[PDB]
Protein backbone atom coordinates (compact mmCIF):
# COMPACT_ATOMS: atom_id res chain seq x y z
CA UNK A 1 0.00 0.00 0.00
CA UNK A 2 2.90 2.39 0.64
CA UNK A 3 3.88 2.18 -3.04
CA UNK A 4 0.42 3.40 -4.06
CA UNK A 5 0.79 6.19 -1.51
CA UNK A 6 4.07 7.03 -3.24
CA UNK A 7 2.73 6.97 -6.81
CA UNK A 8 -0.16 9.25 -5.89
CA UNK A 9 2.44 11.98 -5.36
CA UNK A 10 3.79 11.23 -8.83
CA UNK A 11 0.28 11.97 -10.09
CA UNK A 12 0.18 15.16 -7.99
CA UNK A 13 3.39 16.21 -9.74
CA UNK A 14 1.58 15.83 -13.06
CA UNK A 15 -1.22 18.08 -11.74
CA UNK A 16 1.21 20.81 -10.70
CA UNK A 17 3.18 20.51 -13.94
CA UNK A 18 0.02 21.11 -15.96
CA UNK A 19 -0.65 24.16 -13.77
CA UNK A 20 2.94 25.28 -14.43
CA UNK A 21 2.41 24.87 -18.18
CA UNK A 22 -0.80 26.90 -18.11
CA UNK A 23 0.80 29.74 -16.18
CA UNK A 24 3.80 29.68 -18.53
CA UNK A 25 1.41 29.99 -21.46
CA UNK A 26 -0.23 33.02 -19.83
CA UNK A 27 3.19 34.61 -19.27
CA UNK A 28 4.21 33.98 -22.87
CA UNK A 29 0.94 35.56 -24.01
CA UNK A 30 1.02 38.67 -21.85
CA UNK A 31 4.73 39.38 -22.35
CA UNK A 32 4.06 39.35 -26.08
CA UNK A 33 1.16 41.72 -25.54
CA UNK A 34 3.17 43.99 -23.27
CA UNK A 35 6.28 44.20 -25.45
CA UNK A 36 4.29 45.17 -28.52
CA UNK A 37 2.89 48.34 -26.90
CA UNK A 38 1.06 49.63 -29.92
CA UNK A 39 1.07 47.71 -33.15
CA UNK A 40 2.50 48.88 -36.44
CA UNK A 41 -1.04 49.89 -37.48
CA UNK A 42 -2.16 51.49 -34.25
CA UNK A 43 0.68 53.90 -34.96
CA UNK A 44 -0.66 54.44 -38.48
CA UNK A 45 -4.06 55.46 -37.17
CA UNK A 46 -2.58 58.03 -34.77
CA UNK A 47 -0.58 59.40 -37.70
CA UNK A 48 -3.81 59.55 -39.72
CA UNK B 1 -4.76 6.44 -8.25
CA UNK B 2 -6.28 7.37 -4.89
CA UNK B 3 -9.27 5.11 -5.57
CA UNK B 4 -7.07 2.16 -6.40
CA UNK B 5 -5.20 2.92 -3.19
CA UNK B 6 -8.39 2.86 -1.13
CA UNK B 7 -9.44 -0.42 -2.75
CA UNK B 8 -6.15 -1.83 -1.50
CA UNK B 9 -7.04 -0.36 1.88
CA UNK B 10 -10.27 -2.36 1.67
CA UNK B 11 -8.33 -5.51 0.77
CA UNK B 12 -6.02 -4.83 3.72
CA UNK B 13 -9.09 -4.54 5.94
CA UNK B 14 -10.50 -7.83 4.63
CA UNK B 15 -7.26 -9.64 5.30
CA UNK B 16 -7.27 -8.20 8.83
CA UNK B 17 -10.80 -9.62 9.17
CA UNK B 18 -9.55 -13.03 8.03
CA UNK B 19 -6.67 -12.86 10.49
CA UNK B 20 -9.00 -11.92 13.36
CA UNK B 21 -11.21 -14.88 12.45
CA UNK B 22 -8.11 -17.10 12.45
CA UNK B 23 -7.23 -15.84 15.94
CA UNK B 24 -10.77 -16.50 17.21
CA UNK B 25 -10.71 -19.93 15.60
CA UNK B 26 -7.35 -20.63 17.24
CA UNK B 27 -8.69 -19.67 20.65
CA UNK B 28 -11.68 -21.95 20.16
CA UNK B 29 -9.92 -25.03 18.75
CA UNK B 30 -7.00 -24.98 21.19
CA UNK B 31 -6.86 -27.37 24.09
CA UNK B 32 -6.44 -24.90 26.97
CA UNK B 33 -9.55 -22.90 26.10
CA UNK B 34 -12.44 -21.63 28.22
CA UNK B 35 -14.12 -25.03 28.27
CA UNK B 36 -11.14 -27.01 29.61
CA UNK B 37 -10.56 -24.75 32.59
CA UNK B 38 -14.32 -24.49 33.11
CA UNK B 39 -14.68 -28.27 33.49
CA UNK B 40 -11.54 -28.46 35.63
CA UNK B 41 -12.74 -25.56 37.80
CA UNK B 42 -16.14 -27.10 38.46
CA UNK B 43 -14.67 -30.54 39.03
CA UNK B 44 -12.07 -29.29 41.49
CA UNK B 45 -14.70 -27.17 43.24
CA UNK B 46 -16.73 -30.35 43.79
CA UNK B 47 -13.69 -32.33 44.99
CA UNK B 48 -12.57 -29.44 47.21
- Please list every residue in chain A whose beta carbon sits closer than 8 Å to the beta carbon of residue B2: 8
- Please list every residue in chain A whose beta carbon sits closer than 8 Å to the beta carbon of residue B4: 4
Q: Is the CB of A1 less than 8 angstroms away from the CB of B4?
A: no
Method: cryo-EM
Residue B12: closest C-alpha in chain A: A1
* Angle in degrees, CA B13, B14, B19, rounded to 5: 95
Closest Cα to residue A1, out of B16, B14, B11, B17?
Answer: B11
Buried b (16+ CB within 10 A) or exposed e, B1-17: eeeebeeeeeeeeeeee
- Asked if residues A37 and B48 have their Cβ atoms less than 8 Å apart, the reply is no
In units of Å, what resolution does this entry have? 3.3
List residues of A whose CB lies inside 8 A of any B CB.
1, 4-5, 7-8, 11
Amino acid sequence: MQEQALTELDAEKKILEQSRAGAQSRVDSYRALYDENVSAEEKRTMDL
Amino acid sequence: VRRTATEMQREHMEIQQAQTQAQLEFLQRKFSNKALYSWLRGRLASIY
